[PDB]
Amino acid sequence: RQWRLIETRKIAKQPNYQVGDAKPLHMPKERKKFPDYKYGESNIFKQSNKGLYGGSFVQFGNNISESKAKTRKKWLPNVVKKGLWSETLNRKISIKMTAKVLKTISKEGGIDNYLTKEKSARIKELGPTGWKLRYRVLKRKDEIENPPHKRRRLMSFLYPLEKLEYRSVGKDLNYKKFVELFADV
Amino acid sequence: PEMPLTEVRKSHLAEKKELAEREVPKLTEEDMEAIGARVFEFLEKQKRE
Amino acid sequence: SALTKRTHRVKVQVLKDFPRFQLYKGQVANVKPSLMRNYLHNFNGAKYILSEEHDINTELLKQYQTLEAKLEED
Amino acid sequence: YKQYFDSLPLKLKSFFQRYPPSIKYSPVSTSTKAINANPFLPNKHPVTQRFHDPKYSLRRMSDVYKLALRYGVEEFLPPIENTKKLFFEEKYNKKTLMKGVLLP
RNA sequence: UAAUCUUAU
RNA sequence: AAGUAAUUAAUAUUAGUAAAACAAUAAGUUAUAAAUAAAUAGAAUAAUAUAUAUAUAUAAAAAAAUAUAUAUUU
RNA sequence: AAGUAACUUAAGGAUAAGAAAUCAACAGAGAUAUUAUGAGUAUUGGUGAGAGAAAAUAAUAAAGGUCUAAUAAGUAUUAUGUGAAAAAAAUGUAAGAAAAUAGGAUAACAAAUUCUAAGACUAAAUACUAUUAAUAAGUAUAGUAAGUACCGUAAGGGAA
């Protein structure tokens, strides 16, 4: 097979922003939660952006009679709503799937496994939703593997002292501001 | 935020690192000379015939 | 297909009692894929086992075997 | 000699640079991690146990071999025994005629 | 009937 | 304000070239053999069709058609 | 007619293609692209209208090969409904492999041969715009105003 309707897609190349450079005119309010999906978000069978369609877009072709009188028809995939169990998330995740995709999931032995397969083909035939799910699972796995220590209290201890010092000079100091200051330190 | 690397990807990376760590095959001056001499001999033989 | 339905199985390990489906905790069974995805796999109730070495739980399986032996005796 | 070597075609020169003749590369398929792994053969990766495709894909390998033949630098290239390709006079001589040719 | 599945809170 | 342009093919006339031409690195096109659905067949074994060539046919002929031979090749 | 107009979406200075599971044929060649030739030829078609390659040979063209992948399965294939007039690759539904001891390619088969899918990157030759420069058996109705006056509720039209 091929992933033509996926890998044809192109997204505007964001310029790498240096810390000292000037701002863009429209900077967003809330930050980027998820990683950027290489292949954007489908602009044709937008039905499939909400689910795990397995790179199965709608076809259009011809109904043909005994007289060979051609008439345009479309061929939809066998989509199905299906709440499937994630071991990593410890909850079942309900989404639209192609019956094919459900079969693949069953073969691979789980939904998390399906999401996390490292092949490029899989990545292509994950949606934007599928990509987000993958990210959620992978991040959770990483957390499970590696808890922070294998600092917050120190910051909390120092904060009031820092505030007092600021006041003695003359200025007031908030927590949030303190946190912002001492993130990289 | 960058997506984390899955187990297979990590293993591949480790393998690549191990490969890099080994001594790299590089074409020595001596090897080039040996080749060049052989080429010359071949040319001489061609000229003769 | 009907043939497919008959012959398609999925090797799982149950991690929970399942009285309706006749599957006792720790048992390693070749179940129907539909059954696995719908009933067994939910709430960490069972687990898919592709690689028998890495995936499978050993102690649970041993316990199941012991239970089966006890049943046979009785 | 050095000047003559330099005068060799580009692809051949590049090959010699990146797989030099000091290393006696294997005739048979090997581990991908090995130093003597033949770039023309499909070597097996030891962990996954999957045959990697040859480092030089078959066309490129053939071109390299033809270049070597032209300039008489065959034996410095690693062996093409277990790659099924023969070339020119050796191919002509060693081949069996088709069943259709011998037995119509 | 923990297949689907409607509704309500 | 209205038979024109581009890409082809054919015929004429002229000019160059000529059993060659075009183009010139090659490659190709056209003619240099007629044919026959097509195949591996192909034009005087003593000269004008009463010779020979191919197609039907066939032991080879004859018989239709078309084609080919009468110092210098068309 | 024609995947053309039209409508939608998205990306870049270009993009697309690109380093062979390509062709071929017992010889062999070696990414892609554009053009010529092959060739209106093979092929094809209510065997009508009509449509029509490739190999190979040259032009153009750039450093033009090169690791990025722990080597690729719900994929190869298959069945089926579709599917660039030739020439296939794709795609819905569903079945479904194998490890180079392999696999793709040819109704089929037997030989032989070739190549490595289900992972990648890639200048230049190109489209377009704008500019400068040069040439015009082009323009004074293609010579500067004007999208103005004006018509229309509007899109739109459109002078001298």
Solved with = cryo-EM
Structure-token match 């062996």, residue found: D79
Is there a contact between C48 and C10 (Cβ–Cβ < 8 Å)? yes
Structure tokens at B17: 């690192």
Cα gap C72→A174, rounded to integer Å: 72
Amino acid of residue D88:
F
Nearest Cα of chain D lies from the Cα of B16 at a distance, in angstroms, of 9
Is there a contact between A60 and A42 (Cβ–Cβ < 8 Å)? no
To what resolution in angstroms was this structure determined?
3.2
Structure-token match 């390299």, residue found: D64
Cα gap B38→B41, rounded to integer Å: 5
Give the number of other CB atoms < 10 A from CB of residue A105: 22
Q: Which residues have CB under 8 Å from A80's CB, separation 6+?
A: A96, A97, A98, A99, A102
Residue D73 with chain B: CB contacts under 8 Å: 35, 38-39, 42
Cα gap A95→A93, rounded to integer Å: 7
Query: At residue C11, what are phi and psi to the nearest 5 degrees?
Result: -80, 115
Structure tokens at A7: 């890998």
Closest C1' nucleotide to A120's CA: G119
Is there a contact between D5 and B36 (Cβ–Cβ < 8 Å)? yes
The three-state secondary structure class of C18 is strand
Structure tokens at D96: 């069996």
Q: How big is the CA angle at A111 (ends A106 and A116), to the nearest 5 degrees?
A: 120
Residues linked to residue D31 through DSSP beta bridges, in sequence order: D44
Is there a contact between A32 and A44 (Cβ–Cβ < 8 Å)? no
Is there a contact between C39 and C71 (Cβ–Cβ < 8 Å)? no
Q: Which of A101, A146, A154 is nearest to A126 (CA)?
A: A101
- Classify the C-alpha dihedral A112-A116-A122-A127 as positive or negative: positive
C11 membership: H or E segment, kind and range: strand C10-14
Cα gap C68→A127, rounded to integer Å: 45
Is there a contact between D28 and D69 (Cβ–Cβ < 8 Å)? no
Amino acid of residue D91:
K
The three-state secondary structure class of D49 is coil
Cα gap A95→A79, rounded to integer Å: 10
Is there a contact between A82 and C40 (Cβ–Cβ < 8 Å)? no
Give the number of other CB atoms < 10 A from CB of residue A159: 16
Cα gap B45→A139, rounded to integer Å: 67
Q: Which of D39, D44, D70 is nearest to D56 (CA)?
A: D39
Q: How many CB pairs under 8 A join A and C?
A: 24
Cα gap A148→A157, rounded to integer Å: 20
Q: Give the one of B3, B8, B9 whose C-beta lies nearest to A135's C-beta.
A: B3
Residues linked to residue A59 through DSSP beta bridges, in sequence order: A75
Q: Cα-atom radius of gyration of chain C, to the nearest Å? A: 13
Chain G bases closer than 7 A to any CB of the protein: 9-12, 16, 19-20, 22, 26-31, 63-76, 81-83, 89-96, 99-101, 110-120
CA distances from residue C63 to A184, C34, C60, D6 in whole angstroms, order as listed: 51, 26, 5, 73
- Kindly report which amino acid residue has its CA closest to the C1' atom of nucleotide G96: C4
Cα gap B8→A122, rounded to integer Å: 14
Give the number of other CB atoms < 10 A from CB of residue A18: 7
Structure-token match 């005068």, residue found: D7
Cα gap D46→D26, rounded to integer Å: 16
Structure tokens at D89: 């006079």
Cα gap A115→A141, rounded to integer Å: 12
Cα gap A66→A77, rounded to integer Å: 26
Verify if strand G has an atom below 7 Å from the CB of A1. Answer: yes
Structure tokens at D69: 């033949």
Is there a contact between C30 and C46 (Cβ–Cβ < 8 Å)? no
Q: Which residues have CB under 8 Å from D17's CB, separation 6+?
A: B27
Q: Which of A173, A137, A138 is nearest to A158 (CA)?
A: A173
Cα gap A109→B36, rounded to integer Å: 58
Can you say how many angstroms the Cα of residue A80 is from the centroid of all Cα atoms in its chain? Answer: 21
Q: Which of A6, A1, A4 is nearest to A126 (CA)?
A: A6
Query: At residue D35, what are phi and psi to the nearest 5 degrees?
Result: -80, -40
* Farthest-apart Cα atoms in chain B, separation: 69
What is the DSSP track for chain A?
A: ---HHHHT-----PPP--TTSPPPS---SSPP-SPPPTT---SS-GGGGGSB--S-PPEEEEE--TT---EEEEE---EEEEEEEETTTTEEEEEEEEHHHHHHHHHHTSHHHHHH--SHHHHHHS-HHHHHHHHHHHHHHHHHH--S---HHHHHHHHHHHHHHHHHHT----HHHHHHHTS--
Residue D22 with chain B: CB contacts under 8 Å: 25, 27-28, 30-31
Q: Which of D103, D40, D43, D35 is nearest to D74 (CA)?
A: D40
CA distances from residue C57 to A177, C52, C68 in whole angstroms, order as listed: 50, 9, 17
